[PDB]
Coordinates of all heavy atoms in Angstrom, one line a residue:
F1255 N 104.0 141.6 64.6 CA 103.7 142.3 65.9 C 102.6 143.3 65.6 O 102.7 144.1 64.6 CB 104.9 143.0 66.5 CG 104.6 143.8 67.7 CD1 104.5 143.1 68.9 CD2 104.4 145.1 67.7 CE1 104.2 143.8 70.1 CE2 104.1 145.8 68.8 CZ 104.0 145.2 70.0
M1256 N 101.6 143.3 66.5 CA 100.5 144.3 66.3 C 100.0 144.7 67.7 O 100.1 144.0 68.7 CB 99.2 143.6 65.6 CG 99.4 143.3 64.2 SD 99.7 144.7 63.1 CE 98.1 145.5 63.2
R1257 N 99.6 146.0 67.7 CA 99.0 146.5 68.9 C 97.5 146.8 68.7 O 97.0 146.9 67.5 CB 99.6 147.9 69.3 CG 101.0 147.7 69.7 CD 101.6 149.0 70.3 NE 102.7 148.7 71.1 CZ 102.7 148.3 72.4 NH1 101.5 148.3 73.0 NH2 103.8 148.0 73.0
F1258 N 96.7 146.9 69.7 CA 95.3 147.3 69.7 C 95.0 148.3 70.8 O 95.7 148.3 71.8 CB 94.4 146.1 69.7 CG 94.4 145.3 70.9 CD1 93.6 145.6 72.0 CD2 95.1 144.1 71.0 CE1 93.5 144.8 73.2 CE2 95.1 143.3 72.1 CZ 94.3 143.6 73.2
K1259 N 93.9 149.0 70.6 CA 93.3 149.9 71.6 C 91.8 149.4 71.7 O 91.2 149.1 70.7 CB 93.3 151.3 71.2 CG 94.7 151.9 71.1 CD 94.7 153.3 70.4 CE 93.6 154.2 70.8 NZ 93.7 154.4 72.3
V1260 N 91.3 149.4 72.9 CA 89.9 148.9 73.1 C 89.2 149.9 74.0 O 89.7 150.5 75.0 CB 89.9 147.5 73.7 CG1 90.7 147.4 75.0 CG2 88.5 147.0 73.9
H1261 N 87.9 150.1 73.7 CA 87.0 150.9 74.5 C 85.7 150.1 74.7 O 85.2 149.5 73.7 CB 86.6 152.2 73.8 CG 85.5 152.9 74.5 ND1 85.7 153.8 75.6 CD2 84.2 153.0 74.3 CE1 84.6 154.3 76.0 NE2 83.6 153.9 75.2
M1262 N 85.3 149.9 75.9 CA 84.1 149.2 76.2 C 83.1 150.0 77.0 O 83.5 150.7 78.0 CB 84.3 147.8 76.8 CG 83.1 147.1 77.4 SD 83.5 145.8 78.6 CE 83.9 144.4 77.4
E1263 N 81.9 150.1 76.6 CA 80.8 150.6 77.5 C 79.8 149.5 77.8 O 79.5 148.7 76.9 CB 80.0 151.7 76.8 CG 80.9 152.8 76.3 CD 80.2 153.8 75.4 OE1 79.0 153.5 75.0 OE2 80.8 154.9 75.0
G1264 N 79.4 149.4 79.0 CA 78.5 148.3 79.3 C 77.7 148.6 80.6 O 77.8 149.6 81.2
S1265 N 76.8 147.6 80.9 CA 76.0 147.6 82.1 C 75.9 146.1 82.5 O 75.8 145.2 81.7 CB 74.7 148.3 81.9 OG 73.8 147.6 81.1
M1266 N 75.8 146.0 83.9 CA 75.7 144.7 84.5 C 74.6 144.8 85.5 O 74.8 145.6 86.5 CB 77.0 144.2 85.1 CG 77.8 143.5 84.0 SD 77.3 141.8 83.5 CE 77.5 140.9 85.0
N1267 N 73.5 144.2 85.4 CA 72.3 144.3 86.3 C 72.0 145.8 86.5 O 71.7 146.2 87.6 CB 72.6 143.6 87.6 CG 72.3 142.1 87.6 OD1 72.2 141.5 86.6 ND2 72.2 141.5 88.8
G1268 N 72.1 146.6 85.4 CA 71.8 148.0 85.5 C 72.9 148.9 85.9 O 72.8 150.1 85.8
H1269 N 74.1 148.3 86.3 CA 75.2 149.1 86.8 C 76.1 149.5 85.5 O 76.7 148.6 85.0 CB 76.1 148.4 87.8 CG 75.3 147.9 89.0 ND1 74.9 148.8 90.0 CD2 75.0 146.7 89.4 CE1 74.3 148.2 91.0 NE2 74.3 146.9 90.7
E1270 N 76.2 150.7 85.2 CA 76.9 151.2 84.0 C 78.4 151.3 84.3 O 78.8 151.7 85.4 CB 76.4 152.5 83.5 CG 74.9 152.4 83.1 CD 74.7 152.2 81.6 OE1 75.7 152.0 80.9 OE2 73.6 152.1 81.1
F1271 N 79.2 151.0 83.3 CA 80.7 151.2 83.5 C 81.3 151.4 82.1 O 80.7 151.2 81.0 CB 81.3 149.9 84.1 CG 81.1 148.7 83.3 CD1 82.1 148.3 82.4 CD2 79.9 147.9 83.4 CE1 81.9 147.2 81.6 CE2 79.8 146.8 82.6 CZ 80.7 146.4 81.7
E1272 N 82.5 151.8 82.1 CA 83.3 152.0 80.9 C 84.8 151.5 81.2 O 85.3 151.7 82.3 CB 83.4 153.5 80.5 CG 82.1 154.0 79.9 CD 82.2 155.3 79.2 OE1 83.3 155.6 78.7 OE2 81.2 156.1 79.3
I1273 N 85.4 150.9 80.2 CA 86.8 150.4 80.2 C 87.5 151.0 79.0 O 87.0 151.0 77.9 CB 86.8 148.9 80.1 CG1 85.7 148.2 80.9 CG2 88.2 148.3 80.4 CD1 86.0 148.1 82.4
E1274 N 88.8 151.3 79.2 CA 89.7 151.7 78.2 C 90.9 150.9 78.3 O 91.4 150.6 79.4 CB 90.0 153.2 78.2 CG 88.9 154.1 77.6 CD 89.1 154.2 76.1 OE1 89.9 153.5 75.5 OE2 88.3 155.0 75.5
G1275 N 91.5 150.5 77.2 CA 92.7 149.6 77.4 C 93.5 149.6 76.1 O 93.2 150.1 75.1
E1276 N 94.7 148.9 76.2 CA 95.6 148.8 75.1 C 96.3 147.5 75.2 O 96.5 146.9 76.3 CB 96.7 149.9 75.2 CG 96.3 151.3 75.2 CD 97.3 152.4 74.8 OE1 97.4 152.7 73.6 OE2 98.0 152.9 75.7
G1277 N 96.5 146.9 74.0 CA 97.2 145.5 74.0 C 98.2 145.4 72.9 O 98.4 146.3 72.1
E1278 N 98.8 144.2 72.9 CA 99.9 143.9 71.9 C 100.0 142.4 71.9 O 99.7 141.7 72.8 CB 101.2 144.6 72.4 CG 101.7 144.1 73.7 CD 103.0 144.6 74.1 OE1 104.0 144.1 73.5 OE2 103.1 145.4 75.0
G1279 N 100.6 142.0 70.7 CA 100.8 140.5 70.7 C 101.4 140.2 69.3 O 101.8 141.0 68.5
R1280 N 101.4 138.8 69.1 CA 102.1 138.2 67.9 C 101.0 137.5 67.2 O 100.7 136.3 67.6 CB 103.2 137.3 68.3 CG 104.1 137.9 69.3 CD 105.3 138.5 68.6 NE 105.9 139.4 69.6 CZ 107.0 140.2 69.3 NH1 107.5 140.2 68.1 NH2 107.5 141.0 70.2
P1281 N 100.3 138.1 66.2 CA 99.1 137.4 65.7 C 99.3 136.1 65.1 O 98.4 135.2 65.1 CB 98.6 138.4 64.6 CG 99.2 139.7 65.1 CD 100.5 139.4 65.7
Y1282 N 100.5 135.8 64.5 CA 100.7 134.5 63.9 C 101.2 133.4 64.9 O 101.2 132.2 64.6 CB 101.7 134.6 62.7 CG 101.2 135.5 61.7 CD1 101.4 136.9 61.7 CD2 100.4 135.1 60.6 CE1 100.9 137.8 60.8 CE2 99.8 135.9 59.7 CZ 100.1 137.3 59.8 OH 99.6 138.1 58.8
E1283 N 101.6 133.8 66.1 CA 101.9 132.9 67.2 C 100.7 132.7 68.1 O 100.8 131.8 69.0 CB 103.1 133.5 68.0 CG 104.3 133.8 67.1 CD 105.5 134.3 67.8 OE1 105.5 134.3 69.1 OE2 106.4 134.8 67.2
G1284 N 99.6 133.5 68.0 CA 98.4 133.3 68.8 C 98.5 133.8 70.2 O 97.7 133.4 71.0
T1285 N 99.4 134.8 70.5 CA 99.6 135.3 71.8 C 99.3 136.8 71.9 O 99.7 137.5 70.9 CB 101.0 134.9 72.3 OG1 102.0 135.5 71.4 CG2 101.2 133.4 72.4
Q1286 N 98.8 137.2 73.0 CA 98.5 138.6 73.2 C 98.4 138.9 74.7 O 98.0 138.1 75.5 CB 97.3 139.1 72.4 CG 96.1 138.4 72.8 CD 94.9 138.8 72.0 OE1 94.7 139.9 71.7 NE2 94.1 137.8 71.5
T1287 N 98.6 140.2 75.0 CA 98.4 140.7 76.3 C 97.6 142.1 76.2 O 97.7 142.7 75.2 CB 99.7 141.0 77.1 OG1 100.5 142.0 76.3 CG2 100.5 139.7 77.2
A1288 N 96.9 142.4 77.3 CA 96.3 143.7 77.3 C 96.3 144.3 78.7 O 96.3 143.5 79.7 CB 94.8 143.7 76.8
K1289 N 96.3 145.6 78.8 CA 96.1 146.3 80.1 C 94.9 147.1 80.0 O 94.8 148.0 79.1 CB 97.4 147.2 80.4 CG 97.4 147.7 81.8 CD 98.6 148.7 82.0 CE 98.9 148.9 83.4 NZ 100.4 148.9 83.7
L1290 N 93.9 146.9 80.9 CA 92.6 147.6 80.9 C 92.5 148.4 82.2 O 93.0 148.1 83.2 CB 91.5 146.5 81.0 CG 91.4 145.5 79.8 CD1 91.5 146.1 78.5 CD2 92.3 144.3 80.0
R1291 N 91.8 149.5 82.0 CA 91.5 150.5 83.1 C 90.0 150.7 83.1 O 89.4 151.1 82.1 CB 92.2 151.8 82.8 CG 93.8 151.7 82.8 CD 94.5 152.9 82.3 NE 94.1 153.2 80.9 CZ 94.6 152.5 79.9 NH1 95.3 151.4 80.0 NH2 94.2 152.9 78.6
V1292 N 89.4 150.6 84.3 CA 88.1 151.0 84.5 C 88.0 152.6 84.6 O 88.7 153.1 85.5 CB 87.4 150.4 85.8 CG1 86.0 150.8 85.9 CG2 87.5 148.9 85.7
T1293 N 87.3 153.2 83.7 CA 87.2 154.7 83.7 C 85.9 155.2 84.1 O 85.8 156.4 84.4 CB 87.5 155.2 82.3 OG1 86.6 154.6 81.4 CG2 88.9 154.8 81.9
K1294 N 84.9 154.4 84.3 CA 83.6 154.8 84.9 C 83.0 153.6 85.5 O 83.1 152.4 85.0 CB 82.7 155.4 83.8 CG 81.4 156.0 84.4 CD 80.5 156.5 83.3 CE 79.7 157.8 83.8 NZ 79.6 158.8 82.8
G1295 N 82.3 153.7 86.6 CA 81.6 152.6 87.2 C 82.5 151.8 88.1 O 82.0 150.7 88.5

Side-chain angles (χ1 to χ4, degrees):
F1255 175 79
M1256 291 295 291
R1257 294 190 159 275
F1258 64 86
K1259 293 163 52 52
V1260 57
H1261 171 82
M1262 166 200 283
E1263 307 170 350
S1265 68
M1266 272 291 293
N1267 276 17
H1269 301 289
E1270 299 266 359
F1271 63 93
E1272 289 191 32
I1273 317 280
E1274 278 278 7
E1276 302 201 89
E1278 60 175 288
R1280 313 270 162 181
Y1282 301 89
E1283 306 179 9
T1285 57
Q1286 59 184 316
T1287 59
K1289 189 183 199 143
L1290 300 315
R1291 295 169 298 287
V1292 180
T1293 58
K1294 183 182 217 143

